[PDB]
Symmetry: C2
Subunit: 73 residues, 2 copies
């Protein structure tokens, strides 16, 4: 298998999957964008207009090449 | 004071990034501090701080009170 595909945890995928977290935004309660935990979104905002959001602490749209201009770094 | 205290735990799980409203072809983008300075100089940028465990609902910041407290 490719390098980094073993089952020892000292491998790249352990580090790149680690700094992620998920939360919800409720657009029904609004306009300053809020952040809501999963338990509250399911119980406190049942039937509301909700949005799932996943954050990667180190992800950068600029360096990732998703913006109109290429990253200068 | 000793660092083994509640405030150490409550300050730890935070991270910050920038949104560039000038570069709006990617909606709700996330940009690092180095890129916002060198790649988006003069753009309409917004600093955003997030706490992994913060919840506006439980915090009482929304119109209705939280039902899970
Ligand atoms: Zn909550
Ligand atoms: Zn709501
Ligand atoms: Zn950049
Ligand atoms: Zn970047
Ligand atoms: Zn920009
Ligand atoms: Zn976050
Ligand atoms: Zn709640």
């Amino acid at each position: 298998g490719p390098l980094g595909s073993g089952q020892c945890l000292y491998k790249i995928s352990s580090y790149t999957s680690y700094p992620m977290h998920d939360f919800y935004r409720c657009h029904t309660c609004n306009t300053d964008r809020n952040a809501i935990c999963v338990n509250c979104i399911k119980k406190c905002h049942q039937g509301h207009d909700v949005e799932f959001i996943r954050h990667d602490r180190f992800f950068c749209d600029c360096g990732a090449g998703t913006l109109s201009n290429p990253c200068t770094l």
